[PDB]
Design a protein around this ligand. Structure first.
Ligand code: ERY
Lengths: 232, 273, 54, 230, 338
């Protein structure tokens, strides 16, 4: 064999070793996809969770494990095309503010389209309800009510398994639990046990959101290992 | 006196036949979904398939013993064939035990661990692990090729009892270490996800219970057989090793059912089959 | 306004697209078949070349 | 790119010397290095060769065992340890870079080198040692090889270098194929045993010595060199 | 005034439809029914290219049938050699989400892009030896879909903002803009004469544009789903279009109408990549059934099937001489056939 061919094979082996080394850092990182509407408070989330451009990458390390969150803001309403590129990802954090009672139907339709996607059938969706203080103040003052948009708000009682935080009015608890039930009703549709949603409550000044995301990803990884390592 | 009269030899042979047929059915069903399916090549599925082929060699060596269980005094279909059969026999048992130990360790490393160090799946790792486990099984079965010889069912000569005792006492680790690992690792596994998951805890519990009830009487056997100093001890050895063999074959038939049929992916592959 | 602008643009585009020469399907199919046959022997996928040229 | 070599001086035979070579402006880790010695009024000779990551290191038949070479990737340096020097080791050493891939140009840049004054192989022969030629007409240089340089893959391994008086050699042809920065006036054609280098119009800047090198095996061998009189 | 313009537009559409129908005197099948059968062709995996750390999405052959470029969601561009099966170069990308890649005809530049809304052009003939960022074309308000090299100075690109742009490598500015489509443009296909190019978009219609004029001359319709792949005939007068409806179509630049339709009651999965051979006798099409079907371009009968990949066939390419075919799926495996 000629010398140039042997040198080329040696360079290819070096490149393969470099790829094998990059495998260690590529497999030990979790890629999350942040989604949300225009009025959603995802900007506050990305600016406070720092523990013409296209894709927005945010790398944050918590509990000795790193997460790479990807956000799409420069794209139009077209989503069914490029979302197939966001497959195999670790988790999909869909943030939506519930204080806007007018555009709740749009967010519900968006969540339904995300959950009922043909390619996103395996990846779960982590649901976050941002801007809780504004909604609580608005429902306590009585300015804008819920039954003016959804007639099912009056025909809903407080569930018995509710565990509210001591120090809040029962009205805001009933409202948040009704919103959670309405989100679960569309989340459980076409579930088939392959993926489960994680409805969680959050705020803007809330700082332990990273811990909740870590716990949700831990549960997701546990379910993945149970489905993979023959234990489910 | 006569060993194993017909009144007890017929029911044990019938239960042996039904155990054999259900075991071979389960084992061919297990092995037929790992060859033509590419999604069924999970790291744990390689250990599952290796245990399956080990149990398959066990079950194909089984007939040459059922038939021994009938007429022990005649020839054994070859001087070297009996030694080869005992060798592969013990090998497959050692390989299955080592595979169960490795599978418990892998389930611990995959289900229990912090999201710090949780991945290697080198493929290289799983292949080298199965290779090393099979090599250790064959190395441990080698002394059975060394000991057994032609001295008038081809029984060993009563002049090497010390070597047999010490070797089986080295093979006692193949029962204590699997019991010491598969119990505490599955223990932490059931502890984390309990303090759908209750189904996994029940599965692990019934698995370890079957493991104990199927592997303990076997070793009682070895050890008793090695304590055959009296004439009545010979008869007790017969009547204990018969049920020990039956329980070991029950283990070999139920192990794929316990480790494969419970999985959703395996049932999906069986449905698409 | 922009609606009248896009309407006029679409009208102009349709008027320009309408003034194009279109040949029959028979002659086009004949030309395509002739071009495909003219290179039938020079196709490694259609004609399996021996291993000496691979 | 830039290569700065140092370590020359008056060394008695039998001593030890560490020649250093610092590279600046390119990826030294991805480029393999070669050492070439040149005696005063003589031809070229390959000394040693090192690859990327020190995975492939080779020496010539006359320096095997005595001299060694090492590289430092974090510091971007090359070191050459020469021990037990002989009386014939007086020469000028050049450190050259070369990358190996499809469409590459090995031995493209030649360093400055340092002088040192102490106290089978495919031998390349050239029937034309000195051709006094007038500028403006075409020049034809011949080269004969003892072994067929045409490998089974169909590629021809032959390199042409132009060493101008007082300047470092420059690569003209690396494979018929023309090197980068070299004008199209140079061409090369021939079979696996004979080669001809053709210059359409020679200018005042084309004066120099033409060396040929074969790259079929690891122990490279240079030619005698053809010089042209202006 | 808007109603009159809309009525005139619909009247012109009806007129052009009647004109295209009047020219359809006979179909291609009634003429090609007399040709000899193509039979069956068997393709076996000759070379297997492994090393990709993510899912493969695009590939392209250079001016020679030896080098190959491919893209993966990791953000690494690996130059593959089909003969000796080694890795030539390794270009690290800043954005990992890449969806398209191309090789310049001069063999000196390689373009890439994706969800980053910016096109990165790297130089392979640098004097320093290491690949560095050469050109960064930005300005598109959407993700890049496909890019192809026309010359060593200009390059066309397509984005999800319903606009196509012909950038200049020298200055880095939009030289020609195409805003005739009404949906997200998906795929592009240049002409062998390097003067026209046909683009398939999300509006279930393909449009042909010029490099100098910059105006769409013909509009083809007939698809009932999202067109995702497109490739022109080697002669430069016809082109195939594939959609998610599992029905491929073959349109003609001269006839200005649909000529042939490829479909099967067994296939229901969408088409991802379509390409032609050196002579155009056979039509290759990658489907989402983990297989790739090669039909006859004139008889539309199933000539061959390829089940080498276990994942969705994402990208498919044919060499300039038709000596080998490259197939890349999401299983990080880039296989070579024949
Ligand atoms: C002397 C006289 C005894 O011989 C033996 O013990 C030999 C030396 C066994 O190997 C000894 C070898 C020994 C001692 O090794 C420690 C021990 O494992 C037992 C006792 O079998 C053989 C082959 C047994 O195979 C073993 O049957 C076991 C129930 C399971 C074991 N394998 C499936 C798990 C398998 O190999 C086997 C065929 O059942 C014996 C049948 C004919 C009997 O039941 C009769 C009554 C035997 O007790 C015997 C002939 O009187």
């Amino acid at each position: 064999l000629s010398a140039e061919d042997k040198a080329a094979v040696e360079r290819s082996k070096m490149i393969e070793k470099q790829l094998q080394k990059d495998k260690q850092v590529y497999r030990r990182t979790l890629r999350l996809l942040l989604l949300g509407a225009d009025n959603s408070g995802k900007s506050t989330i990305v600016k406070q969770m720092r523990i013409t451009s296209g894709i927005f990458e945010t790398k944050f390390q918590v509990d000795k494990v790193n997460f790479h969150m990807f956000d799409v803001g420069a794209q139009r309403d077209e989503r069914r095309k490029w979302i197939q590129c966001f497959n195999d990802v670790t988790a999909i954090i869909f943030v939506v503010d519930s204080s806007d009672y007018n555009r709740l139907q749009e967010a519900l339709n968006d969540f339904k389209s995300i959950w009922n996607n043909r390619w996103l059938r395996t990846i779960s969706v982590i649901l976050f309800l941002n801007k809780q203080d504004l909604l609580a103040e608005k429902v306590l003052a009585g300015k804008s009510k819920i039954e003016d948009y959804f007639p099912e708000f009056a025909r809903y009682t407080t569930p018995e398994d509710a565990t509210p935080e001591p120090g809040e009015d029962p009205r805001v608890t009933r409202a948040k639990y009704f919103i959670r039930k309405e989100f679960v009703d569309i989340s459980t549709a076409s579930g088939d046990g392959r993926h489960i949603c994680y409805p969680h409550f959050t705020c803007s000044v809330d700082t332990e959101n990273a811990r909740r995301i870590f716990n949700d990803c831990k549960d997701i990884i546990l379910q993945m290992n149970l489905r993979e390592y023959n234990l489910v | 006196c006569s060993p194993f009269p017909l009144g007890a030899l017929v029911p044990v042979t019938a239960v042996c036949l039904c155990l054999f047929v259900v075991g071979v059915s389960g084992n061919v069903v297990t092995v037929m979904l790992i060859g033509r399916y590419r999604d069924m090549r999970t790291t744990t599925n390689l250990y599952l398939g290796s245990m399956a082929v080990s149990d398959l060699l066990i079950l194909l060596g089984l007939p040459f013993d059922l038939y021994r269980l009938w007429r022990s005094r005649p020839w054994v279909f070859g001087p070297l064939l009996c030694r080869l059969s005992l060798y592969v026999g013990e090998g497959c048992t050692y390989a299955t035990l080592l595979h169960m130990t490795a599978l418990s360790v892998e389930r611990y490393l995959a289900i229990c661990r912090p999201l710090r160090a949780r991945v290697l799946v080198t493929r290289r790792r799983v292949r080298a692990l199965i290779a090393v486990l099979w090599a250790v099984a064959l190395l441990s079965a080698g002394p059975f090729l060394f000991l057994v010889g032609v001295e008038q069912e081809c029984r060993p000569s009563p002049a090497q009892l010390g070597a047999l005792r010490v070797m089986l006492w080295v093979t006692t680790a193949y029962f204590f270490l699997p019991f010491l690992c598969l119990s505490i690792l599955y223990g932490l596994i059931g502890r984390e996800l309990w303090s759908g998951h209750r189904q996994t805890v029940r599965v692990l519990l019934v698995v370890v219970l079957a493991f104990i009830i199927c592997w303990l009487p076997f070793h009682v056997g070895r050890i008793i057989y090695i304590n055959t100093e009296d004439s009545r001890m010979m008869y007790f050895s017969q009547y204990f090793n018969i049920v020990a063999l039956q329980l070991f074959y029950l283990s070999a038939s139920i192990n794929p059912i316990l480790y494969n049929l419970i999985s959703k992916k395996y049932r999906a592959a069986a449905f698409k089959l | 306004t922009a609606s009248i602008a896009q309407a006029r643009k679409l009208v102009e585009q349709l008027k320009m697209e309408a003034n194009i020469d279109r040949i029959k399907v028979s002659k086009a199919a004949a030309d395509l078949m002739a071009y495909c046959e003219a290179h039938a022997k020079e196709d490694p996928l259609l004609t399996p070349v021996p291993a000496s040229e691979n | 790119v830039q290569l700065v070599e140092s370590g020359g001086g008056l060394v008695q035979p039998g001593g030890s010397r560490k020649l250093s070579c610092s590279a600046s402006g390119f990826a030294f880790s991805s480029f393999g290095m070669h050492w070439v010695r040149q005696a005063p009024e003589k031809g070229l000779e390959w000394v040693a060769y090192i690859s990327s990551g020190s995975g492939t290191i080779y020496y010539a038949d006359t320096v095997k065992g005595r001299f060694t070479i090492s590289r430092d990737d974090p510091k971007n340096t090359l070191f050459l340890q020469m021990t037990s020097l002989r009386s014939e080791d007086t020469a000028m050493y050049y450190c050259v870079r070369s990358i190996y891939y499809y469409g590459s140009s090995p031995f493209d840049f030649w360093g400055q080198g340092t002088t040192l004054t102490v106290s089978a192989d495919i031998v390349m022969t050239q029937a034309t040692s000195s051709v006094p030629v007038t500028p403006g007409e075409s020049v034809s240089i011949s080269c004969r090889s003892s072994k067929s340089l045409l490998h089974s893959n169909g590629n021809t391994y032959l390199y042409w270098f132009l060493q101008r008086p007082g300047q470092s050699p420059q690569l003209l042809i690396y494979r018929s194929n023309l090197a980068s920065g070299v004008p199209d006036r140079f061409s090369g054609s021939g079979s696996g045993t004979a080669f001809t280098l053709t210059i359409s119009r020679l200018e005042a800047e084309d004066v120099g010595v033409y060396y040929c090198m074969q790259h079929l095996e690891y122990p490279l061998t240079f030619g005698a060199g053809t010089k042209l009189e202006l | 005034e808007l109603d009159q313009l809309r009525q005139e537009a619909e009247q012109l559409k009806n007129q052009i439809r009647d004109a295209r129908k009047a020219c359809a005197d006979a179909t291609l099948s009634q003429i090609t029914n007399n040709i000899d059968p193509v039979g069956r062709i068997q393709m076996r995996t000759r070379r297997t290219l492994r090393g990709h750390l993510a899912k493969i999405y695009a590939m392209h052959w250079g001016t020679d049938s030896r080098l190959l470029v491919s893209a993966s969601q990791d953000g690494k561009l690996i130059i593959w050699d089909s003969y000796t099966t080694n890795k030539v170069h390794a270009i690290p990308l800043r954005s990992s989400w890449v969806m398209t890649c191309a090789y310049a005809p001069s063999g000196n530049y390689v373009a890439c892009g994706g969800l980053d809304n910016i096109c990165s052009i790297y130089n392979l003939k640098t004097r320093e030896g290491n690949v560095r960022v050469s050109r960064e074309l930005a300005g598109h308000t959407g993700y890049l879909s496909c890019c192809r090299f026309l010359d060593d100075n200009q390059i066309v690109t397509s984005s999800g903002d319903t606009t196509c742009a012909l950038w200049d490598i020298e200055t880095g500015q939009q030289t020609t803009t195409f805003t005739g489509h009404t949906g997200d443009v998906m795929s592009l296909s240049l002409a062998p004469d390097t003067r026209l190019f046909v683009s398939g978009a999300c509006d279930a219609s393909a449009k042909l544009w010029d490099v100098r004029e910059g105006m769409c001359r013909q509009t083809f319709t007939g698809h009932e789903s999202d067109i995702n792949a497109i490739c022109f005939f080697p002669n430069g007068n016809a082109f195939a279009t594939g959609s998610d409806d599992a029905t491929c179509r073959l349109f003609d630049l001269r006839a200005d109408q649909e000529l042939m339709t490829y479909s099967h009651d067994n296939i229901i999965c969408g088409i991802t990549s379509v390409s032609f051979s050196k002579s155009g006798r056979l039509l290759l099409a990658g489907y989402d059934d983990f297989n790739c079907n090669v039909w006859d371009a004139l008889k539309a009968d199933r000539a061959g099937v390829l089940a080498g990949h276990d994942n969705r066939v994402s990208c498919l390419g044919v060499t300039d001489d038709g000596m080998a075919v490259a197939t890349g799926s999401w299983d990080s495996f880039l296989k070579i056939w024949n």
